[PDB]
Design an enzyme around this catalytic site. Structure first.
Site, PDB file in Angstrom:
ATOM      1  N   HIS C 355      41.041  43.713  42.503  1.00 16.79           N
ATOM      2  CA  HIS C 355      41.381  42.691  40.712  1.00 16.79           C
ATOM      3  C   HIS C 355      41.441  41.229  41.280  1.00 16.79           C
ATOM      4  O   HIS C 355      42.748  41.042  41.408  1.00 16.79           O
ATOM      5  CB  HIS C 355      42.542  43.525  40.530  1.00 16.79           C
ATOM      6  CG  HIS C 355      42.719  43.202  39.356  1.00 16.79           C
ATOM      7  ND1 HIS C 355      41.638  42.414  38.203  1.00 16.79           N
ATOM      8  CD2 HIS C 355      44.097  42.851  38.486  1.00 16.79           C
ATOM      9  CE1 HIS C 355      41.565  41.170  37.081  1.00 16.79           C
ATOM     10  NE2 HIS C 355      43.211  41.965  37.244  1.00 16.79           N
ATOM     11  N   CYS C 385      41.992  44.219  30.033  1.00 11.81           N
ATOM     12  CA  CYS C 385      43.465  44.135  30.354  1.00 11.81           C
ATOM     13  C   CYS C 385      43.956  42.485  30.065  1.00 11.81           C
ATOM     14  O   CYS C 385      43.433  42.485  31.113  1.00 11.81           O
ATOM     15  CB  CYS C 385      44.220  45.146  30.222  1.00 11.81           C
ATOM     16  SG  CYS C 385      44.818  45.553  31.760  1.00 11.81           S
TER      17      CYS C 385
END
Lengths: 398, 398, 399, 399
Positions: C355, C385
């Site tokens: 990520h 998110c």
């Protein structure tokens, strides 16, 4: 065998004050230069220069003594070493000088100290891994405990000097009224001493460059004539809630430098140098960290003993004022009253300043000069030292 | 009167090497602990602890001596102080101890040194104005000159140690082949000394925690058996283009700690402590910064003279190897050959390591132990010191 | 059809201090930008502007990486560039930004991209406010989260870490530990399988790393582990709350990576024979309470679907960024979907892939588009998110 | 006409380490954001997303100032936010972004703003790459320019400072020192005159500053000086090149400030009785060579005007950000306009008012819109030069 023939000190400045622009190595050079210039002893005659410094991380790094003596124009042959026993480093420097003369090595030695708490740098840890993660801390070396060792935190705490002062205030039952009263006197005697010219001999002005023009700092900026017992009582505790030690009855952070010239008795005689005093005995001692304030008690008893003297033979006492609470605790052990004519006659650190590394040599300078004018035979100079220690030196006037 | 009854040292680690995970205060505590444990002299008997440290800005801040002794379990009464005369701080610590015993103060003293160049922190200047502007520098305290004083820059330069080594190589005309030859010897003698067990007595293993399990570092990791004269010649100059000093014929940066226990002769006799050697004379001297390498010369001369001996009375000589070039220049003045059987018999700093603060006490430790096994009467320990200084100590075996 | 995705590329994702730690962000992004254009057959001078997402622009990625990167990548001085920052979702915002410009009829060729070098994130030090200060200071590590905290902020909402917000959600929706680790094990398995079977060969472009004197070619995400087991995963201790559920194993790591997608106007595509990979249908951004930022995709996806006139059921491929197993599953709870759904992160998620903040947005879009084409899915959804309480989603139609 | 500007506000502009040095950016921007909505009569919950420009997001403005500022300002948790960074032009880029979203028919209410606190910009320190390093490190002052320089960048184009590129322009266009100082003198006079006559009263919103125990109200740009003289200006020495022409006096300073504009869809405005201030006609962005970034406004204004179907002569009010007297005049050369043009920065420019980077874009648009309304001008232009070679411009039509 070990004689004090000259004592000098720069005035003491407030933190970020009058001498915040002068770097420690340069500041100490001023003291070293002035000591030798007025003594009439060529620089080339000095064998080695000992200097005390509590924090050698900034402009005072890598042996200030040697840097400073070179800066001061001493010939390349003069050696130097920087000693560090915290608050008491200044005195330890003189002790070291004396011990050398006693060992019959050199004939001319200098004992000094310097500390610029204003310019103390920040210290940052080195990474131990490749691409770290996690914030880091930049420790301000101007303060105290840093890079703390867990094992240390576990054995004894890491309470601040100010906190140990409270620990003492508790233990000896030293009230707030008494602490502030002691503090008021320090200011009053200091102000009086300056005003009456007792500091004129020992203090050597320091030129400060403010932009384009030079200013001459020539007086401690610490003492305040307007210090009142009411104002002192209005200040809030600073180390323990509902405490007793305030910023007003404890020493500040300061900048300053001091140096004393010691020579062998034979040398003095061969060159007609008039002695100020003679180093009689020295002693060092350790006490529990939590109450480092009483360090002067066992140190002074060991020193007096080594000099075959009794406290009562002392005619002038220089007890460094780290905190009113600490100083009074020491006075309790000695069974002395803060009104004792022999105690810090021209003021103490609470009013004058506590430039760590230099204080030891600073107070010895003030002691010797005062011993001479009032013709006292025996003087004592002793200090408390951070993390639990004490140092004392007994001097005999001449 | 001042006797050396015990000497120990931790092995010397490479920078960021075997001991990089051990912090200086803890490292020095291992040495201090070992010293007393093997001696059979209760800790409470020690009067004061002197320790040298070249950079007290990190985990070695605020008087490592005191911090170390407490961490090592010594009782709170034992005092401590950290001396700093750079490269020679280790020896200055022993001298300091000796002079105290001679002054007849305490009866038991410890002279030591420590330096963790792996963990040396960064130093950042303090702002002088409100909201500054402009980039700042984070000085790596592991290195040399920092927070440089302009005045210093003008009077004498701020040449690096390595550069001063070159200045010497030029001045005395010390060839590269000669320097590398000298370096090869340091390794061979070191490899040999270890291999034959001569370091077994003086070295105390240090436990390093690697994650969950402990490892025991018990040998200097500097010496290399595969050191060859060809490899050494293939290195490029490091301090001056077309120069002669290479990373191979100069000491490295290391971590290490050493401590020696000195006691008064009367005390030794009262407690059955068998002397390793006796402190004869001490001398300190300064030389021009640009060629600090030569410091040992005037210091060794002063020391020998004070001990009333001649260089030829020496039976073992420990000349700290800061740089092949510098050592050889010193040898030139003494008219000695790098093949002298008395010189650094078990190797020198080029192969063993130069943990600044601890080196002085380190080489004294190696000297004394070898003196005893080969029954030499007079030994000399001397070193060059940064920014132009030199210290030397003469010792008599017993 | 006005805004068309004609090319999607991404560099492999490296572990913190890993395979790409030696590569600086601006250079890394340049590699993605250069590669995107090279294989597209569209001269660099044709590009109008370059949008790029970056969560931390304090280090080598300072002063608008987009512009720095493009110049570094050899683009002509005329090409513009801007760096967008909506944290975790910056990569997707970059694409949205590009699309919206094409719809406004300005330029005809835009690049939407993102980069993040978590390995080289610098330290931030406050400025003195007074003359000769006193007191210790702090060097904030920009690789991490909250820093230079604002008291007022602390008072209104907390400053709970992402990891903690994950826990808050696990609690709120009662997402067990066994469930979380099970979800994580799948991310790894699908990823290992996708690489193994070559599904990543099209979208990935190798990055040359210089190790001393010689170059090495990083060409595979170093995150996925074949040895990932349900046993090992269960043996990890909570990392954000004592007696908690979120472990380092069922949460995404910190990584380095860059991705870029080339969007062009439909009329431009037709004029140059560029084959469409997909078409941008609708975009939606939404805010949710900080303490449970994890659900951000929920309101964003409903807004995006509604704007595209579609139902969740019309989606044939769904890329839900895996910030935390717990957060993902909570989102899946709202959607009433099983982590076994064949549409969900078909080739693995961030837990196994990585990520790299700023680039994640564009990274998942790239993986979605390419998979949409090979399995000929008509509608795809990419949503994430976002830290401090936000969510972004983009609906795409294959072609 | 889908994107209408209904409200515009800005905090006063303070000097470096001046009147607003105690206020943190995130807090500063919240003031602008709160103020914008409070006087608009549009409930906060109505705002869809908030775009904000910020050149340096390394300090108190880290991790998406827009979202932090909007939460701090009391906006409900659902309002989204994103921080855009196109350096000097970030402020404008934020409004452009808002407009493009309204045009795409997503939300109905958006906010475009910018903030920059150059006083509190932190220091940035590199991360070690090896175990126990050796060698001094540098702490880069993010208040300044080039940092963490990429060698490759240094080789392709230089790393000349803004001030230097201003000299390159002075040289290229032969803009004399006397001309530059004269332009600077007019910026101050118009600014002083504007304040004095109350033309800033509508657009400026006071900022409360805490000075120890009591609050002080900063309510006027502290940059403009009535005593500015043509003689004093000529006394200053070059600051970027020996024997040069650019001085501290004919260049913009470093300042703190924030500004925000409220944009809403035309149908929304109608349904809620919001009176339009202006209408966003066209937007354009363009890149120019780094060594002369000053001219960025030229190609951007051309592309914008063309996209709006207008000619420069149709412009009734021009706001050209004054980064450097030398840079501004070079642009004026290209447009064939005289610094005396009554349309040009009517109430003063950056040289006198200030250049709080990230916020300047939105700041000048605010001053433009308000002045457009009072003198009923029909077409206005807002454009700026951008660091490292860029330019942005926005055309607005009064209503």
């Amino acid at each position: 065998e070990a004689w004090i023939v000259e004592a000098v000190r720069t005035p003491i400045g407030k933190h970020g004050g009058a001498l915040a622009s002068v770097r420690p190595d340069d500041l100490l050079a001023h003291a070293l230069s002035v000591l030798v210039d007025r003594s009439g002893v060529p620089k080339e005659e000095v064998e080695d220069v000992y200097a005390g410094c509590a924090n050698q991380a900034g402009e005072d790094n890598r042996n200030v003594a040697r840097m400073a003596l070179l800066l001061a124009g001493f010939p390349v042959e003069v050696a130097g070493c920087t000693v560090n026993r915290l608050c008491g480093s200044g005195l330890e420097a003189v002790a070291q000088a004396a011990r050398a003369i006693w060992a019959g090595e050199g004939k001319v030695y200098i004992g000094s100290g310097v500390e610029s708490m204003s310019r103390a740098p920040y210290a940052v840890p080195k990474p131990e891994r490749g691409f770290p993660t996690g914030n880091l801390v930049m420790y301000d070396t101007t303060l105290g405990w840093r890079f703390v060792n867990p094992k240390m935190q576990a054995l004894y705490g890491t309470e601040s000097m100010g906190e140990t002062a409270e620990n003492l205030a508790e233990m000896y039952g030293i009230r707030r009224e008494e602490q502030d009263r002691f503090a008021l006197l320090s200011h009053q005697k200091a102000v009086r001493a300056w005003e009456e010219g007792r500091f004129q001999d020992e203090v050597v002005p320091v030129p400060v460059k403010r932009g384009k023009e030079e200013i001459l700092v020539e007086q401690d900026e610490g003492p305040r004539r307007d210090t009142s017992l009411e104002k002192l009582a209005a200040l809030r505790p600073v180390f323990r809630e509902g405490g007793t030690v305030t910023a007003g009855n404890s020493s500040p952070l300061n900048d300053g430098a001091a140096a004393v010239l010691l020579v062998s008795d034979d040398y003095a005689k061969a060159h007609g140098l008039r002695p100020l005093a003679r180093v009689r005995a020295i002693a060092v001692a350790g006490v529990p960290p939590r109450i480092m304030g009483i360090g002067p008690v066992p140190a002074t008893r060991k020193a007096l003993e080594r000099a075959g003297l009794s406290f009562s033979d002392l005619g002038l006492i220089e007890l460094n004022e780290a905190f009113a609470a600490q100083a009074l605790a020491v006075l309790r052990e000695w069974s002395l009253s803060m009104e004792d004519q022999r105690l810090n006659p021209n003021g103490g650190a609470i009013a004058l300043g506590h430039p760590l590394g230099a204080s030891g040599a600073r107070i010895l300078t003030t002691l010797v000069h005062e011993m001479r004018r009032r013709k006292v035979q025996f003087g004592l100079a002793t200090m408390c030292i951070g993390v639990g220690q004490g140092i004392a030196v007994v001097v005999e006037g001449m």
